[PDB]
């Protein structure tokens, strides 16, 4: 019913911004929340990866591969299959903690949780909100980038590629 | 529909509630201005007002003054602004003396001697500093071109 209390509400007044009324009951909300988080986490990593590659960085043995969606089209599928295998394994490993917010995998075999990062309940809520918000942004970001790549070849719109300043990494 | 009514519902006061005098826009702007805003201390009120007035004053002098075309024109403009600020500060000091007197008690009421003195001080610091900021900014103007 009232999901205003849930983290990620647009604002105090609008509460839950569900224009198409996708969410109807808590059961649905949990489903949608889990999905949003998953897509968000995945997207956050994706943007990081796209930028790294597009800017020019390549792993050992990957110095001739192309960047962007072009890579997926050109690079050999055999060298892409590893990704699926390393991801499917994770899919199986992550274990949802019962009676907890959607996306909490504290029950996973390897140690996972707020650990030393959070102490008070408020701290936990803040970190959670930030994870969700940054994911929401990336989700839009990765799309924005890919679209513009196809449109003009400039994935960053205002510049060709990033230049990093890593003193210690040098 | 009448958009003009007696002010404060007093038909005999010398004022009227027009859209200009009493609109959400005017009310909002005036309420949050440093002079009438709530919570600001006398010093901070002066500071904000000074910061605002000093930044725009360097312009007239710098671009239209006697040494505008000289390489030291901006520097001269800065000095001129500081001079004007000093004159205005003298005025503030003198006004306070006459309007408020010599010893005060209420405190924290912009309309007392102590508060006024603090207000004046803030104005001077803010104004002079703001003018300096403009000097730094006008030293190199960005073209915002990619």
């Amino acid at each position: 019913a009232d999901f205003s209390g849930e983290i990620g509400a647009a604002n105090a007044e609008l509460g839950c911004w569900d224009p198409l009324n996708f969410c109807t009951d808590q059961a649905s909300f949990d489903k949608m929340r889990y999905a949003e988080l998953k897509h968000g986490r995945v997207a956050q990593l994706a943007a990081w990866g796209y930028a790294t590659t597009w800017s020019g960085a390549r792993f050992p043995g990957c110095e001739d591969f192309p960047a962007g969606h072009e890579a997926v089209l050109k690079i050999g599928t055999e060298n892409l299959i590893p990704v699926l295998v390393v991801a499917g394994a994770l899919e199986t490993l992550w274990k949802q903690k019962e009676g907890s917010f959607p996306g909490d995998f504290s029950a996973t075999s390897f140690p996972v949780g707020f650990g030393p990062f959070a102490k008070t309940e408020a701290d936990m809520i803040d970190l959670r909100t930030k994870e969700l918000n940054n994911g929401r942004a990336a989700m839009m970001g990765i799309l924005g980038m890919i679209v513009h790549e196809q449109i003009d070849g400039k994935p960053f719109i205002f510049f060709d590629k990033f230049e990093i300043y890593a003193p210690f990494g040098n | 529909a009448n958009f003009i009514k007696p002010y404060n519902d007093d038909p005999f006061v010398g004022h009227l509630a027009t859209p200009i005098t009493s609109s959400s826009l005017t009310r909002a702007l005036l309420k949050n201005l440093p002079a009438y805003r709530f919570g600001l201390t006398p010093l901070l009120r002066g500071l904000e007002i000074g910061l605002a007035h000093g930044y725009f004053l360097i312009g007239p002098f710098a671009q239209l003054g006697p040494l505008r075309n000289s390489d030291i024109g901006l520097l001269a403009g800065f000095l001129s602004t500081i001079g004007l600020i000093l004159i205005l500060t003298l005025g503030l000091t003198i006004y306070g003396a006459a309007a408020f007197g010599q010893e005060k008690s209420n405190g924290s009421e912009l309309q007392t001697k102590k508060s006024w003195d603090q207000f004046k001080g803030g104005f001077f610091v803010g104004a002079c500093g703001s003018a300096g900021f403009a000097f730094i900014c006008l030293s190199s103007i960005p073209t915002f071109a990619l």
Binding site: - | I4, P11, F12, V13, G14, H15, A17
Partner: protein, 132 residues
């Protein structure tokens, strides 16, 4: 009991709130339109009416107009900032133009205007010939 008026920019100012203020009151038998000294037109109420002004002259000017409407029950007061009120006109209940037994003479000189003293005579005295 305020008469019906829509407001003006010619009303009272701060002096009315920090120095002194005035007020006139009267009773009417009909609702009619009068012109107010401040500027504009207003409609009096059928009965008691009260109006505030900044000067005594403004109040007395309105009284003149009221007399045209055949109203002669007007009263003028001065309200100080603290709330103190002074009844000013008609002071003794009788209009000044009508001799009322019980009123004493003030500022009267018992001689023709030409019998005042010479200025030189009262030199270095501080008084004036007309007060001498």
């Amino acid at each position: 009991p305020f008469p019906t008026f829509g407001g003006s920019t010619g009303g009272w100012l701060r002096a009315a709130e920090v120095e002194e203020k005035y007020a006139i009151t009267w009773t009417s038998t009909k609702e009619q339109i009068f012109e107010m000294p401040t500027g504009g037109a207003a409609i009096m109420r059928n009965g008691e009416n009260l109006l505030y002004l900044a000067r005594k002259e403004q109040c007395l000017a309105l009284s003149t107009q009221l007399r045209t409407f055949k109203i002669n029950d007007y009263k003028i007061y001065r309200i100080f900032p603290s709330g103190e009120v002074q009844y000013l006109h008609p002071k003794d209940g009788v209009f000044p133009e009508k001799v009322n037994p019980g009123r004493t003479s003030v500022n009267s000189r018992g001689f023709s205007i030409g019998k005042n003293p010479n200025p030189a005579s009262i030199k270095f005295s501080g008084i004036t010939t007309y007060e001498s």
